[PDB]
């Protein structure tokens, strides 16, 4: 399965100056519990802001630097090269790769973030016409997570 993985806004902001706009554990927690054990693709810009690679589970970056090597991280540098991965492959981010995958993934994870922040990247739209709601569960808010959110999993139809 090839699965697009994203937090975004009302207005589908995922990040401002390479990073996010918000913080909320709840989401990370829940990228945790999807991905563990998987696989996640993401642009050379995405794995620069996370750092280092996330621990128990297979990290691959898209880059054209070939001079990429980093311990811990998978290099690639085609979207061909996606389509080989096995198991459950989750497009990661950033913008520039939710752009280019979302016409190809099987489904997406998409936490709404129910606010409007500033922001200079964004998840391309999409309507619900070409995707079925598999489940939609709004996420409890507490002192550590002030932001309302949904997690929604959304089929191509
Ligand atoms: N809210 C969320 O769910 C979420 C998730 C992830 C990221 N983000 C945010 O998204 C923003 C970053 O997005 P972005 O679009 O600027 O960058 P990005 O997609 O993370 O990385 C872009 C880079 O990926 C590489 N790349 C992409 N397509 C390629 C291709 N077809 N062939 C070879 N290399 C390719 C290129 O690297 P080279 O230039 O090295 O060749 C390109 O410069 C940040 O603000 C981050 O915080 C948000
Ligand atoms: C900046 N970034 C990219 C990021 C952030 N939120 C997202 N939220 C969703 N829904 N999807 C993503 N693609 C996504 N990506 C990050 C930053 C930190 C960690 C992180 O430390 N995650 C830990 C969990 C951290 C925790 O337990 O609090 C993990 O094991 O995955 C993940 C991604």
């Not at 697009?4 to 990073?19: K, M, P, S, T």
């Not at 802001?49 to 970056?61: A, E, M, T, Y």
């Given at each position: 399965?090839?699965?697009?993985?994203?937090?975004?806004?009302?207005?589908?902001?995922?990040?401002?100056?390479?990073?996010?706009?918000?913080?909320?554990?709840?989401?990370?927690?829940?990228?945790?519990?999807?991905?563990?054990?998987?696989?996640?693709?993401?642009?050379?810009?995405?794995?620069?802001?996370?750092?280092?690679?996330?621990?128990?589970?297979?990290?691959?970056?898209?880059?054209?630097?070939?001079?990429?090597?980093?311990?811990?991280?998978?290099?690639?540098?085609?979207?061909?090269?996606?389509?080989?991965?096995?198991?459950?492959?989750?497009?990661?981010?950033?913008?520039?790769?939710?752009?280019?995958?979302?016409?190809?993934?099987?489904?997406?994870?998409?936490?709404?973030?129910?606010?409007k922040?500033?922001?200079?990247?964004?998840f391309?739209?999409?309507?619900?016409?070409?995707?079925?709601?598999?489940?939609?569960?709004?996420?409890?808010?507490?002192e550590?997570?002030?932001?309302?959110?949904?997690?929604?999993?959304?089929?191509?139809?």
């Amino acid at each position: 399965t090839l699965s697009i993985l994203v937090a975004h806004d009302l207005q589908r902001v995922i990040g401002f100056e390479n990073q996010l706009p918000w913080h909320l554990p709840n989401d990370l927690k829940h990228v945790k519990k999807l991905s563990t054990g998987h696989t996640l693709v993401m642009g050379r810009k995405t794995f620069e802001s996370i750092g280092k690679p996330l621990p128990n589970r297979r990290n691959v970056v898209l880059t054209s630097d070939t001079s990429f090597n980093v311990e811990g991280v998978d290099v690639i540098h085609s979207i061909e090269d996606i389509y080989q991965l096995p198991g459950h492959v989750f497009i990661f981010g950033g913008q520039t790769l939710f752009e280019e995958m979302i016409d190809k993934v099987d489904d997406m994870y998409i936490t709404v973030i129910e606010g409007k922040f500033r922001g200079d990247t964004f998840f391309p739209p999409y309507t619900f016409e070409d995707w079925e709601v598999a489940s939609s569960v709004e996420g409890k808010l507490d002192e550590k997570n002030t932001i309302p959110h949904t997690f929604l999993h959304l089929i191509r139809k």
